[PDB]
Every structure is written in structure tokens, then in C-alpha cells.
Ligand code: HEM
Ligand code: HEM
Ligand code: HEM
């Protein structure tokens with residue numbers, strides 16, 4: 069099976085780059101993020117051609133990169149979607165985990 073990469077991984081398709089640490093989300097099963105495509109968990113980079121390669125942040129299609137990281141109501145929880153459930157009614161955790169600025173994702 070594939071191995072989780074080191075922490076400090078750069079997501080930098082955009083001008084608002086974010087650091088991703090596998091270790092802090094080890095409680096999540098790999099395939100919740102590296103989700104099935106054509107019946108097989110896919111471990112390619114999220115913005116691989118044909119995947120989430122549409123860099124218009126308004127796009128809501130299966131190619132929308134921003135959509136895949138930020139939106140609710142998605143087939144697999146997005147970064148923000150899952151973090152919202154974790155934070156619950158805790159406003160401090162909401163700021164840390166879902167805030168658009170001054171959060172753990174965006175400074
Ligand atoms: C679980 C044990 C698990 C594995 C295994 C795994 C692997 C993995 C690889 C091999 C990469 C590198 C991809 C590349 O070719 O560059 C990678 C990258 C990302 N991962 Fe992961 N990963 C596992 C678990 C999880 C979990 C639980 C999530 C989500 C909560 C997650 C997310 C990500 C993200 C985001 C990346 C960056 C990919 C990008 O295109 O920027 N992983 N992982
Ligand atoms: C990379 C770690 C990665 C993330 C993050 C990610 C997220 C994601 C979400 C949140 C959805 C649901 C969107 C919705 O509106 O329901 C979603 C859906 C699809 N994705 Fe994805 N995805 C990541 C990686 C990849 C890779 C490597 C590809 C391409 C090989 C890919 C493709 C797709 C497709 C197609 C869907 C829809 C699947 C379905 O509806 O069954 N994703 N992704
Ligand atoms: C999606 C690509 C995604 C990002 C980006 C992301 C980031 C992130 C950060 C920055 C933290 C804080 C800890 C750290 O610095 O590493 C953090 C923490 C938690 N996450 Fe996350 N995360 C992304 C995705 C997801 C998904 C899809 C889930 C759940 C299905 C998830 C969960 C969690 C949990 C739980 C934590 C810890 C909460 C805390 O209070 O520390 N993440 N993530």
C-alpha cells in the first residue's frame with residue numbers, strides 16, 4: 069500500500085499556498101481523501117490533469133480545485149467541510165480550522 073509522505077507538504081497551485089501535514093489527520097482513513105475514482109482509491113496529486121485541474125475558484129464541477137478544498141455538501145468531505153464538523157459550535161476551533169484568514173490554513 070502507498071505510504072504517507074512527510075509532513076510539511078506544500079499545496080501551491082494558487083497564490084494562497086497551504087501546508088498539509090498527514091500526521092495531524094492520521095485518524096482519517098487514507099481513502100477518505102485519496103478517494104475512489106473508477107472504483108479505485110486514487111493517490112495522484114489532486115490537481116492532476118483530468119482531476120481537479122480547473123483553477124477558476126467559482127467552478128463547482130468535479131474539476132474545480134477550490135471547490136474540492138472549501139465547499140460543503142460534497143460527496144467526500146472537503147478540507148473545510150470536515151473541519152466544520154470537527155469544530156462544531158466551538159468558535160475558536162472554527163477560526164483555527166475554517167477561518168479564511170488567520171487560520172491554520174491561511175495566515
Ligand atoms: C493514509 C495512510 C494516506 C496515504 C498512504 C497517503 C498518501 C499520499 C501520497 C502518496 C501523497 C503524495 C502525492 C504526490 O504524488 O505528490 C499524498 C498527498 C496528499 N494527501 Fe495523503 N495519504 C494518506 C492520507 C491522507 C488523508 C487522511 C488526507 C486527507 C485528510 C490526505 C490528503 C492529502 C493531500 C491533500 C495531499 C496533497 C496532494 C496535492 O495534490 O497537493 N491524505 N498522500
Ligand atoms: C486529492 C487529495 C484530492 C482531493 C482533496 C479531492 C477531493 C474531492 C472532493 C471533495 C470531491 C467531491 C466534490 C463534490 O462536489 O461532490 C471530489 C470528487 C471527484 N474527484 Fe477528487 N480529490 C482529490 C483527488 C482526485 C484525483 C487524483 C482525481 C483524478 C484522478 C479526482 C477526481 C474526482 C472526480 C472525477 C470526482 C467525482 C467522483 C464521483 O462523483 O464519484 N480526484 N474530489
Ligand atoms: C484538505 C486538503 C485539508 C487541509 C488543507 C487540512 C489542513 C489542516 C490543518 C492545517 C490542520 C491543523 C493541524 C496542522 O497544522 O496540520 C488540520 C487539522 C485537522 N484536520 Fe485537516 N485539512 C484538510 C482536510 C481534512 C479532512 C478531509 C478532514 C476530515 C475528514 C480533516 C480533519 C482534521 C482534523 C480532525 C484535524 C485536527 C483538529 C484539531 O483541532 O487540531 N482534515 N487540518
Ligand code: HEM
Pocket residue numbers: 079080081082083084085086123124125134137138147148151165166167168169171172173174
Ligand atoms: C474561508 C471560507 C476561506 C476562503 C475564502 C478561502 C479562500 C482561498 C483562496 C482565494 C484560495 C486561492 C484560490 C485561487 O485559485 O486563487 C484558496 C486556496 C486554498 N485553500 Fe482556502 N479559503 C478559506 C479557508 C481555508 C481553510 C480553512 C483551509 C484549510 C482547512 C483552506 C485550504 C485551501 C487550500 C488547500 C488551497 C489551495 C492551496 C494551493 O494549492 O495553492 N482554505 N483559498
